[PDB]
């Protein structure tokens, strides 16, 4: 699976 952008670090919950 691949998707993790370069701005996801903040997204989670």
Structural topology:
Elements: no helix or strand
Task: Write up what this structure looks like.
The chain has no helices and no strands. Helices cover 0% and strands 0% of the residues. The chain has 13 residues and is low in regular secondary structure.
Task: Pick out its properties.
0% helix; immune system; type IV turn-type III turn; monomeric; antimicrobial peptide, tritrpticin
Largest sheet: none
| Apparent shape | flat
Distance between the termini: 19 Å
Fraction in helix: under 10%
- Number of E-state strands: 0
How much of the sequence lies in strands comes to under 5%
The helix tally amounts to 0
Q: Roughly how many Å is the radius of gyration?
A: 7 Å
Query: Which structural class matches the secondary elements?
Result: little secondary structure
Short description:
By secondary structure, the protein is low in regular secondary structure. It is classed as immune system.
